[PDB]
Scaffold this motif. Structure first.
Motif, PDB file in Angstrom:
ATOM      1  N   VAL A 150      10.973 -40.621 -18.651  1.00  0.00           N
ATOM      2  CA  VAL A 150      11.320 -42.026 -18.417  1.00  0.00           C
ATOM      3  C   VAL A 150      11.638 -42.205 -16.928  1.00  0.00           C
ATOM      4  N   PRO A 151      11.542 -43.441 -16.400  1.00  0.00           N
ATOM      5  CA  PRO A 151      11.059 -44.662 -17.060  1.00  0.00           C
ATOM      6  C   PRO A 151       9.568 -44.589 -17.361  1.00  0.00           C
ATOM      7  N   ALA A 152       9.133 -45.370 -18.341  1.00  0.00           N
ATOM      8  CA  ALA A 152       7.726 -45.412 -18.721  1.00  0.00           C
ATOM      9  C   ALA A 152       7.425 -46.776 -19.315  1.00  0.00           C
ATOM     10  N   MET A 153       6.176 -47.207 -19.168  1.00  0.00           N
ATOM     11  CA  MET A 153       5.761 -48.467 -19.747  1.00  0.00           C
ATOM     12  C   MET A 153       4.341 -48.355 -20.253  1.00  0.00           C
ATOM     13  N   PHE A 154       4.126 -48.897 -21.447  1.00  0.00           N
ATOM     14  CA  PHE A 154       2.821 -48.837 -22.103  1.00  0.00           C
ATOM     15  C   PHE A 154       2.381 -50.243 -22.475  1.00  0.00           C
ATOM     16  N   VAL A 155       1.088 -50.542 -22.343  1.00  0.00           N
ATOM     17  CA  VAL A 155       0.600 -51.890 -22.654  1.00  0.00           C
ATOM     18  C   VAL A 155      -0.435 -51.876 -23.790  1.00  0.00           C
ATOM     19  N   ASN A 156      -0.236 -52.755 -24.775  1.00  0.00           N
ATOM     20  CA  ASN A 156      -1.087 -52.854 -25.975  1.00  0.00           C
ATOM     21  C   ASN A 156      -1.375 -51.509 -26.640  1.00  0.00           C
ATOM     22  N   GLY A 157      -0.421 -50.585 -26.525  1.00  0.00           N
ATOM     23  CA  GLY A 157      -0.555 -49.246 -27.081  1.00  0.00           C
ATOM     24  C   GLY A 157      -1.739 -48.454 -26.558  1.00  0.00           C
ATOM     25  N   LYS A 158      -2.322 -48.918 -25.455  1.00  0.00           N
ATOM     26  CA  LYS A 158      -3.518 -48.283 -24.910  1.00  0.00           C
ATOM     27  C   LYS A 158      -3.388 -47.741 -23.486  1.00  0.00           C
ATOM     28  N   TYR A 159      -2.599 -48.418 -22.654  1.00  0.00           N
ATOM     29  CA  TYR A 159      -2.522 -48.066 -21.244  1.00  0.00           C
ATOM     30  C   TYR A 159      -1.103 -47.709 -20.824  1.00  0.00           C
ATOM     31  N   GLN A 160      -0.998 -46.716 -19.951  1.00  0.00           N
ATOM     32  CA  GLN A 160       0.274 -46.254 -19.415  1.00  0.00           C
ATOM     33  C   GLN A 160       0.385 -46.564 -17.932  1.00  0.00           C
ATOM     34  N   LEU A 161       1.464 -47.237 -17.546  1.00  0.00           N
ATOM     35  CA  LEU A 161       1.675 -47.559 -16.142  1.00  0.00           C
ATOM     36  C   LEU A 161       1.822 -46.271 -15.337  1.00  0.00           C
ATOM     37  N   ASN A 162       1.234 -46.245 -14.140  1.00  0.00           N
ATOM     38  CA  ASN A 162       1.247 -45.051 -13.304  1.00  0.00           C
ATOM     39  C   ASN A 162       1.807 -45.360 -11.923  1.00  0.00           C
ATOM     40  N   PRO A 163       3.135 -45.518 -11.824  1.00  0.00           N
ATOM     41  CA  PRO A 163       3.723 -45.943 -10.545  1.00  0.00           C
ATOM     42  C   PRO A 163       3.477 -44.974  -9.378  1.00  0.00           C
ATOM     43  N   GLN A 164       3.275 -43.691  -9.667  1.00  0.00           N
ATOM     44  CA  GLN A 164       2.922 -42.709  -8.640  1.00  0.00           C
ATOM     45  C   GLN A 164       1.566 -43.023  -7.989  1.00  0.00           C
ATOM     46  N   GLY A 165       0.777 -43.869  -8.650  1.00  0.00           N
ATOM     47  CA  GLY A 165      -0.479 -44.361  -8.104  1.00  0.00           C
ATOM     48  C   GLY A 165      -0.372 -45.700  -7.378  1.00  0.00           C
TER      49      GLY A 165
END
Length: 188
Positions: A150-165
């Motif tokens: 954590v922290p982590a965020m997922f959208v529509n159960g398909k995509y994962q946010l990648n803040p390191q990018g």
């Protein structure tokens, strides 16, 4: 392109059926989570850009802080059940990480009592099966996205946010990119 798989976000090998549209995981023990919520205000910035009809769900995790970590997941379930998330989020973060006055389940309860939640109301929720199922829901969701941190965020159960990018220099540029990326993923 502007938004790229592997850059601002990644794609779950195993998409989650029936997942919340925008799902954030955090811990009140998590220093980066304190930064995300209390300094960067990631949740709120994401909110202000989301399409109409898209709700955010935010779940606590057990794996930091031992017994107290689980007490906090159970208290977060109580906050969700009572609908008082926006009254306890700041004092729980500050109680755990700033003042470090939250050392026991009783200290957590004190935050709710101080925020105006009646004792009877808190205790009834704390001991309820509705809260037990909400704890189980948070744990199941973590399993479903194969959560590693954590922290982590997922959208529509398909995509994962990648803040390191994303860019890290301007805090605010980072926060806008993060929020803009969630909105893009929401419409994907």
């Amino acid at each position: 392109a502007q938004y790229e798989d592997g850059k601002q976000y990644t794609t779950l090998e195993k998409p989650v059926a029936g997942a919340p549209q925008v799902l954030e995981f955090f811990s009140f023990f998590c220093p980066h989570c304190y930064q995300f919520e209390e300094v960067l205000h990631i949740s709120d910035n994401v909110k202000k850009k989301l399409p109409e009809g898209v709700k955010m769900t935010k779940y606590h995790v057990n794996f930091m802080g031992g017994d107290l970590g689980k007490d906090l997941t159970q208290a977060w379930a109580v906050a969700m059940a009572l609908g008082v998330e926006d009254k306890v989020t700041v004092p729980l973060f500050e109680g755990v990480q700033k003042t470090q006055t939250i050392r026991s389940a009783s200290d957590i309860r004190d935050v709710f009592i101080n925020a105006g939640i009646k004792g009877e109301e808190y205790d009834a929720a704390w001991n309820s099966f509705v809260v037990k199922s909400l704890v189980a829901q948070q744990e199941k969701a973590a399993a479903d996205v194969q959560l590693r941190g954590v922290p982590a965020m997922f959208v529509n159960g398909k995509y994962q946010l990648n803040p390191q990018g994303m860019d890290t220099s301007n805090m605010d540029v980072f926060v806008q990119q993060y929020a803009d990326t969630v909105k893009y993923l929401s419409e994907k």
